[PDB]
Write an enzyme that holds these catalytic residues in place. Structure first.
Site, mmCIF file in Angstrom:
data_model
loop_
_atom_site.group_PDB
_atom_site.id
_atom_site.type_symbol
_atom_site.label_atom_id
_atom_site.label_comp_id
_atom_site.label_asym_id
_atom_site.label_seq_id
_atom_site.Cartn_x
_atom_site.Cartn_y
_atom_site.Cartn_z
ATOM 1 N N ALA A 186 36.002 42.566 31.965
ATOM 2 C CA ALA A 186 35.187 43.660 31.451
ATOM 3 C C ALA A 186 33.710 43.297 31.510
ATOM 4 C CB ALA A 186 35.594 43.997 30.026
ATOM 5 N N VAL A 192 37.639 45.919 34.887
ATOM 6 C CA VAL A 192 38.435 45.788 36.099
ATOM 7 C C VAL A 192 39.881 45.489 35.726
ATOM 8 C CG1 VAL A 192 38.921 44.320 38.090
ATOM 9 C CG2 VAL A 192 36.602 45.169 37.705
ATOM 10 N N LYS A 206 38.624 49.589 39.047
ATOM 11 C CA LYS A 206 37.367 49.417 38.331
ATOM 12 C C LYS A 206 37.035 50.710 37.597
ATOM 13 C CE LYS A 206 32.642 47.639 38.943
ATOM 14 N NZ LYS A 206 32.842 46.188 38.670
ATOM 15 N N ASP A 297 23.224 42.356 45.250
ATOM 16 C CA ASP A 297 23.652 41.411 44.218
ATOM 17 C C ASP A 297 24.663 40.376 44.718
ATOM 18 O OD1 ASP A 297 23.760 40.218 41.705
ATOM 19 O OD2 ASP A 297 25.339 41.567 40.993
HETATM 20 N N1 LIG Z 1 39.878 44.130 43.376
HETATM 21 C C1 LIG Z 1 40.140 43.017 42.647
HETATM 22 N N2 LIG Z 1 41.315 42.374 42.817
HETATM 23 C C2 LIG Z 1 41.602 41.272 42.113
HETATM 24 N N3 LIG Z 1 40.737 40.771 41.222
HETATM 25 C C3 LIG Z 1 39.544 41.375 41.011
HETATM 26 C C4 LIG Z 1 39.221 42.523 41.727
HETATM 27 C C5 LIG Z 1 37.952 42.911 41.307
HETATM 28 C C6 LIG Z 1 37.107 44.070 41.720
HETATM 29 C C7 LIG Z 1 35.774 43.872 42.064
HETATM 30 C C8 LIG Z 1 34.979 44.952 42.429
HETATM 31 C C9 LIG Z 1 35.518 46.234 42.457
HETATM 32 N N4 LIG Z 1 34.719 47.332 42.794
HETATM 33 C C10 LIG Z 1 34.093 47.492 43.954
HETATM 34 O O1 LIG Z 1 34.177 46.696 44.876
HETATM 35 C C11 LIG Z 1 33.266 48.739 44.088
HETATM 36 C C12 LIG Z 1 33.117 49.558 42.974
HETATM 37 C C13 LIG Z 1 32.354 50.717 43.053
HETATM 38 C C14 LIG Z 1 31.733 51.054 44.249
HETATM 39 C C15 LIG Z 1 31.878 50.234 45.364
HETATM 40 C C16 LIG Z 1 32.642 49.076 45.283
HETATM 41 C C17 LIG Z 1 36.840 46.438 42.085
HETATM 42 C C18 LIG Z 1 37.634 45.358 41.724
HETATM 43 C C19 LIG Z 1 37.556 41.985 40.359
HETATM 44 N N5 LIG Z 1 38.525 41.082 40.188
HETATM 45 C C20 LIG Z 1 38.438 39.936 39.249
HETATM 46 C C21 LIG Z 1 37.053 39.306 39.326
HETATM 47 C C22 LIG Z 1 36.428 39.366 37.937
HETATM 48 C C23 LIG Z 1 37.296 40.296 37.100
HETATM 49 C C24 LIG Z 1 38.630 40.433 37.823
#
Ligand SMILES: Nc1ncnc2c1c(-c1ccc(NC(=O)c3ccccc3)cc1)cn2C1CCCC1
Ligand SMILES: [Ca+2]
Ligand SMILES: [Cl-]
Length: 429
Positions: A186, A192, A206, A297
């Site tokens: 969060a 997420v 997300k 970023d």
């Molecule tokens: N997809 C994942 N799969 C597994 N683990 C993930 C993630 C993500 C994660 C990271 C970023 C996003 N969002 C995006 O990439 C995005 C959002 C809005 C517009 C354009 C792009 C969505 C999910 C984050 N995590 C982790 C990292 C920290 C928290 C959980």
């Protein structure tokens, strides 16, 4: 009439999609992009199939040793994956000599260990000594002892089923289709979650918390990111238009690169594989650069790692719809974000990787850093960092953002870091 053939096993998960074993054939009825309407020959059922799971009959792709649309570096990564051994090979589209084919072979060397050597193929042949009518024959011969090669051919490169394409006409989905099963992380802007899309499909969501930014204009900005697909960017699958906005992406099994480098398994990762990560991120940033866009970023917290240890870029195109240790001076002050401001961030990210996730400028607060960037202070080289790698960070850390490298150059330098230019391909008399 157009006959195709299954390359892998596929079990149906939707209503009107087909199930097929490896080797099944079918008649193409429609070409709707990622999904094709086909009539199986084994079951005589008409339905939908993933177009990236089949190819035309007796094409080279059907062959177990051929690999389409793969680069020399990917072919190197694919062969040095677990599950292959001495002699493991593949035949692929020659990245340099276009319209032609190259052969990548796995080989051992006391100096370095496992390596991949590449030979060009020119009817085809490598050495005029041995002529061949076609590739399979050509393969068979080099399975019979190394006729000049560094090793004798053994088994084609191990490949797995590609990711099942997203549901057709499902860019906008109801929330009901989702079950957010676990909060992964969060922040100030949302959470997420890892989720499930109508069973069968594991996704990550997300949840964008309500704000001023793009209340009715998010879909617009978000629709652009959908067209900026790349193998090194996190894939956007679907969207929930009802506020709060949900963004459905692919699930990256091993979380963020930051958390991964801080992990136990991550600490086990040697140096040449850390540079391999960097060259992947650089490959993705080279794409954003080619599309003249901006990530805004860059940091290890925004790099995700697959189960196959593949690094991809998130969020991207999110900072334009809404923290400074990774930021270049000319954006901290003048607020000017270029593609070169990301180059700076990449240099920071590079250090962040070599130091296994250590915070940039340790024991040094934010204000205590900005006043040093004006002096000319840069982070020092650690004992475990190559001199020729710190050299690259410094080039990313130039005061003039115009005399900073391009990701196109950075990627190329990181891709063949341990390989001399002349040693890319092998000479044979
Ligand atoms: N997809 C994942 N799969 C597994 N683990 C993930 C993630 C993500 C994660 C990271 C970023 C996003 N969002 C995006 O990439 C995005 C959002 C809005 C517009 C354009 C792009 C969505 C999910 C984050 N995590 C982790 C990292 C920290 C928290 C959980
Ligand atoms: Ca040579
Ligand atoms: Cl038929």
């Amino acid at each position: 009439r157009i006959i195709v053939v299954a390359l892998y096993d596929y079990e149906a998960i939707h209503h009107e999609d087909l199930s097929f074993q490896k080797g099944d054939q079918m008649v193409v009825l429609e070409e709707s992009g990622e999904w094709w309407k086909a009539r199986s020959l084994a079951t005589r059922k008409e339905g939908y199939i993933p177009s990236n799971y089949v190819a035309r009959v007796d094409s080279l792709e059907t062959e177990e040793w051929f690999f389409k649309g793969i680069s020399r570096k990917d072919a190197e990564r694919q062969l040095l994956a677990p599950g292959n051994m001495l002699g493991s090979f593949m035949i692929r589209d020659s990245e340099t000599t276009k319209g032609s084919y190259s052969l990548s072979v796995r080989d051992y060397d006391p100096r370095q260990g496992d390596t991949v050597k590449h030979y060009k193929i020119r009817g085809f042949y490598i050495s005029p000594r041995s002529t061949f009518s076609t590739l399979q024959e050509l393969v068979d011969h080099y399975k019979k002892g190394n006729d000049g090669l560094c090793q004798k051919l053994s088994v084609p490169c191990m490949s797995s089923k590609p990711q099942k394409p997203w549901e057709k006409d499902a860019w906008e989905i109801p929330r009901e289709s989702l079950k957010l099963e676990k909060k992964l992380g969060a922040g100030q802007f949302g959470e997420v979650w890892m989720a499930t899309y109508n069973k069968h499909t594991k996704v990550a969501v997300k949840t964008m918390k309500p704000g001023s930014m793009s209340v009715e204009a998010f879909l617009a900005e978000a629709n652009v990111m959908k067209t900026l697909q790349h193998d090194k960017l996190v894939k956007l699958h679907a969207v929930v238009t009802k506020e709060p906005i949900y963004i459905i992406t692919e699930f990256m099994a091993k979380g963020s690169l930051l958390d991964f480098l801080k992990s136990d398994e991550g600490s086990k990762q040697p140096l040449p594989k850390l540079i391999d990560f960097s060259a992947q991120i650089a490959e993705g940033m080279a794409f954003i650069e080619q599309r003249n866009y901006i990530h805004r970023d860059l940091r290890a917290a925004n790099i995700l790692v697959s189960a196959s240890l593949v690094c991809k870029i998130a969020d991207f195109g999110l900072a334009r719809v809404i923290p400074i240790k990774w930021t270049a001076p000319e954006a901290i002050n003048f607020g000017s974000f270029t593609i070169k401001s990301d180059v700076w961030s990449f240099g920071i990210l590079l250090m962040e990787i070599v130091t296994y996730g250590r915070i940039p400028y340790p024991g040094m607060s934010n204000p205590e850093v900005i006043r040093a960037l004006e002096r000319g202070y840069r982070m020092p080289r650690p004992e475990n960092c190559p001199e020729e790698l710190y050299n690259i960070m410094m080039r990313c850390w130039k005061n003039r953002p115009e005399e900073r490298p391009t990701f196109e150059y950075i990627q190329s330098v990181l891709d063949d870091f341990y390989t001399a230019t002349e040693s890319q391909y092998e000479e044979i008399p």
